[PDB]
């Protein structure tokens, strides 16, 4: 009958909870979610987009600029090591190549 | 034993490192990239990339730990950045105290010092061979003392410049005149 | 009028606003961003489906979550990740 | 342990060259081969003790094997 | 400094260690081996020091004194000898009933000591002869009971076999304060050990269901005799449901360390705030047995089938000890320097 | 005395070994590699005698399916033996490397 604090900060998150525990109820991925994975996958996600957020933030205020464009989460993540493992076979939208000229070519 | 009054017990020197050893595109420094991208990542190569030992030429010279590619940037010399008429004050100090100058300029207003503060960039020798040049760049403003290369750099090679006395490179055509 | 539809601006916007005080971000980006995160999830909860399915259980716990994230990413990324989610359980806790 | 990567033996590449159809061979196969045996049996194997660990249990049953074999995406039948 | 984070070696020279503690200074480390050997190293120059091969057969608890002389033995023939730090040679010997857990000096006197059964009550001896005071305890229906001393030495806290905690005194047996957690919802569970800080009176609850309490050692005193008190601090894991083995303080008090039973790993929370922060690890199949925190300086010294691993910060080298005028920078740093260009009091050289 | 020039050997081996079917690899010193390199992820494991089977099984086809696409990037380059750049470069196609 009190006030009711949420579950997205009390953990002390940024994603939400309950969302998450919908889309496991709604999906058929098993019968009987548990108790805190909700909890524990909304946690990864906020790493993982904080992780690439990071560097495009990085390289929008390198090249200038103020707003990011895709051509920045492009370089943001082919640059890298491990997200280029991840993200193997993904276009990005208006993306665009790394410069990569071979040694013989040029003069 | 015990019978040797004997000399060179003096250093003259404040930088008694030398010791016994004297051992001698899928980055981001040698792309196509604009400049700040490849100046970020500087400072995490550069406090690896090269050691400083004992070199025949003078003293300690520069060998680095790491194959360098041609065009790449290698490390920064940066220190306190003197404005000009400091510089004649300072000649006639470490005249005083008999140490050498260590003055590179960005422009001919404003002369960066290395003997005060500084880091590892003052071990590189003047030769009339180089293997590297340097190009200033405009990081926001904030101009810097950026060295690059100039060829394919294997492990254990002296790094050296055109500064622009009798040099000690001993080179094919050389001036033997620093002026 | 027109039908609500799920998405996840606000919490990018968050996110952004935390770790970058001045950068915005236009609209195709958070499009990409948008299906980056539908992505994982889809990755993440399919691989925990697949482990309890094999054990002979019925429940997703955060057990078998923390073994699919240990399954799927390469490395140090799964070293940072299990000490973030764990962290955010034990707060959750007490 | 130090040996045994040495241990798998040469006409035994030779015979698994000879099964390929392979007609004359260079002096560094040997150890190119041996280090790719290395690192692909290092990638399924991870993933081995992996199911093992998690499934609670202390040796390395045959469906572990297939089941990182058919995450890896190279799938074998004849033991399931 | 804080916390350790980096593995930083080992000592793997004595085969087949399996116990361990510290004096009160932090200098002195005894091992008791697999069959009787007492060994002591050095920790700031690290070299062997004393092996004390005592028993033929294997012991299975240890302890320093106050004076940082005298230890005391428990091997599986229940012999209690003392020793010494400068000879190192048997005084004492007699046989117990069978078991034998765990021994306590008493902290502002080393005549008496705490000793520990398994199926009986804890009994309290003297140092000049066999004498032994009987300590009651309130179930007497195991006699699994657990005791030990607190801080400053005013009283023993007691734990039973079904989880009721006593207070008694030293001597008179003076029952001033007792306690029931209510464990979970329906069963009340034993407790493995307790253990006690150096900086105030704060302790720990290590139940037998694998979660950890806080409290203090004063406001049991206040509640008095059958009170009802709440825990400080609630500590426990749900992930991995991780059993307990060992369980200790850091420094100050400032922060809690309690090594698994399970996976071989070290956590750090904080008696603070009240989160975990840290999670070590280390080989990743063995089997941990022993915990010490070292009391002056963040070191942690692990026993896992004989390898000691010792947690040490990873101190970084630099300049400026070499020439110290020349000031290794980062980055561009210019300004000018100077805006204007250009007694007999007899101190102790023997001040020991 | 009767030597033959060289290369007959070679083909009637690549007949007599693409027609039948075994095992090229002796199972001693492979089982003592699976059980080498399983010691560093978890100490004490003990394996079956089928999950040896299978590796070995796994293992051997994917080598020979290395070599043929080698054999071809080798008679493309307009030689006949094999050249560990040959390897280098299909593993760098396929998407592996
Ligand atoms: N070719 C050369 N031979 C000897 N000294 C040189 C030289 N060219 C320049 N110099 C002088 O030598 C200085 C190089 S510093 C020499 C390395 C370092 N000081 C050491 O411990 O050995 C410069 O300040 C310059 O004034
Ligand atoms: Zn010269």
Redesign the pocket.
């Known amino acids: 009958r009190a006030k009711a604090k949420t579950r997205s900060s009390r953990a002390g998150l940024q994603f939400p909870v309950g969302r998450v525990h919908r889309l496991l109820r709604k999906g058929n991925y098993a019968e009987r979610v548990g108790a805190g994975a909700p909890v524990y996958l909304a946690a990864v996600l906020e790493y993982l987009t904080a992780e690439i957020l990071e560097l495009a933030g990085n390289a929008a205020r390198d090249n200038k600029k103020t707003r990011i464009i895709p051509r920045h989460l492009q370089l943001a993540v082919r640059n890298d090591e491990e997200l280029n493992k991840l993200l193997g076979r993904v276009t990005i939208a208006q993306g665009g190549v790394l410069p990569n000229i071979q040694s013989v070519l040029l003069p | 034993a015990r019978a040797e009054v004997h000399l060179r017990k003096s250093a003259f020197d404040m ?1 008694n ?2 010791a016994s050893k004297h051992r001698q595109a899928r980055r981001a420094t040698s792309m196509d990239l604009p400049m700040p991208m490849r100046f970020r990542h500087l400072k995490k190569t550069s406090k690896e990339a090269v050691g400083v030992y004992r ?1 025949p ?5 520069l060998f680095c730990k790491r194959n360098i590619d041609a065009g790449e940037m290698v490390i920064e010399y940066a220190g306190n950045v003197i404005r000009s008429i400091q510089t004649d004050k300072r000649e006639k100090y470490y005249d005083s105290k008999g140490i ?3 003055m590179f300029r960005i422009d001919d207003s404003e002369v960066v010092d290395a003997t005060m503060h500084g880091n590892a960039a ?2 590189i ?3 009339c061979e180089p293997n590297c040049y340097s190009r200033v760049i405009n990081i926001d403003g904030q101009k810097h003392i950026v060295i690059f290369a100039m060829r394919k750099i294997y492990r254990g090679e002296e790094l050296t410049y055109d ?1 622009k006395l009798p ?3 001993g080179a094919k055509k050389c001036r033997k005149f ?1 002026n | 009028r027109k039908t609500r539809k799920e998405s996840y601006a606000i919490y990018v916007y968050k996110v952004l606003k935390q770790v970058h005080p001045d950068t915005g971000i236009s609209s195709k980006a958070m499009s990409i961003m948008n299906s980056f995160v539908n992505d994982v999830f889809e990755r993440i909860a399919g691989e925990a489906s697949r482990l309890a399915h094999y054990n002979k259980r019925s429940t997703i716990t955060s057990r078998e979550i923390q073994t699919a994230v240990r399954l799927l990413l390469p490395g140090e990324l799964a070293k940072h990740a299990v000490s973030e989610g764990t962290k955010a359980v034990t707060c959750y806790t007490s | 342990l130090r040996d045994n990567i040495q241990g798998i033996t040469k006409p035994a590449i030779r015979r698994l060259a000879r099964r390929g159809g392979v007609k004359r061979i260079s002096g560094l196969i040997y150890e190119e081969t041996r280090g790719v045996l290395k690192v692909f049996l290092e990638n399924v194997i991870r993933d081995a003790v992996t199911y093992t660990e998690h499934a609670k249990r202390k040796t390395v049953t045959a469906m572990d094997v297939v089941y990182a074999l058919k995450r890896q995406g190279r799938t074998l039948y004849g033991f399931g | 400094q804080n916390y350790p984070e980096e593995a930083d070696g080992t000592l793997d020279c004595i085969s087949m260690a399996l116990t361990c503690t510290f004096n009160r200074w932090g200098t002195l480390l005894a091992v008791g081996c697999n069959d009787g050997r007492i060994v002591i190293w050095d920790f700031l120059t690290r070299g062997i020091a004393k092996i004390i091969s005592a028993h033929i057969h294997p012991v299975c608890s240890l302890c320093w004194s106050r004076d940082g002389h005298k230890l005391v033995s428990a091997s599986t023939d229940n012999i209690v000898s003392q020793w010494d730090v400068l000879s190192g040679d048997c005084d004492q010997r007699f046989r117990f009933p069978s078991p034998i857990l765990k021994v306590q000096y008493h902290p502002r006197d080393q005549n008496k000591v705490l000793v520990c059964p398994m199926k009986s009550a804890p009994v309290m001896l003297t140092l000049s002869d066999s004498k032994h005071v009987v300590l009651p305890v309130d179930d007497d229906s195991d006699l699994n009971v657990v005791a030990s001393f607190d801080r400053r030495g005013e009283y023993i806290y007691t734990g039973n076999a079904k989880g009721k905690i006593l207070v008694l005194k030293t001597d008179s047996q003076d029952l001033v304060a007792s306690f029931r957690v209510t464990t979970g919802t329906s069963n009340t569970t034993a407790i493995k050990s307790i253990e006690f800080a150096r900086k105030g009176s704060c302790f720990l609850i290590n139940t037998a269901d694998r979660i950890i309490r806080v409290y203090d050692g004063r406001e049991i005193l206040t509640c008095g005799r059958d009170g009802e008190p709440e825990p400080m601090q609630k500590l426990q894991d749900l992930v991995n449901r991780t059993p307990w083995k060992k369980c200790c303080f850091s420094g100050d008090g400032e922060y809690i360390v309690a090594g698994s039973a399970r996976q071989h790993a070290l956590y750090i929370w904080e008696k603070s705030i009240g989160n975990l922060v840290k999670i070590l690890h280390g080989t990743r199949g063995e089997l941990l047995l022993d915990v010490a925190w070292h009391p002056v300086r963040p070191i942690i010294a692990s026993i896992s089938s004989g390898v000691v691993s010792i947690w040490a910060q990873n101190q970084v080298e630099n300049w400026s000890a070499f020439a110290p005028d020349f000031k290794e920078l980062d980055e561009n740093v210019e300004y000018e320097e100077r805006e204007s260009e250009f007694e007999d009091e007899e101190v102790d050289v023997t001040s020991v | 005395p009767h030597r033959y020039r060289p290369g007959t050997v070679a083909l009637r081996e690549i007949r007599r070994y693409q027609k039948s079917t075994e095992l090229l690899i002796r199972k001693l010193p492979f089982q003592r590699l699976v059980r080498e390199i399983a010691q560093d992820f978890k100490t004490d494991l003990r394996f079956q005698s089928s999950a040896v089977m299978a590796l070995q099984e796994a293992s051997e086809a994917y080598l020979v399916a290395l070599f043929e696409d080698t054999n071809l990037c080798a008679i493309h380059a307009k030689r006949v033996t094999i050249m560990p750049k040959d390897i280098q470069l299909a593993r760098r196609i396929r998407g592996e490397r």
């Open positions: 930088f490192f030398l070199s030429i003078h003293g300690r010279g050498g100058c260590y003052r071990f020798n003047h030769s500064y040099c000690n490179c620093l």
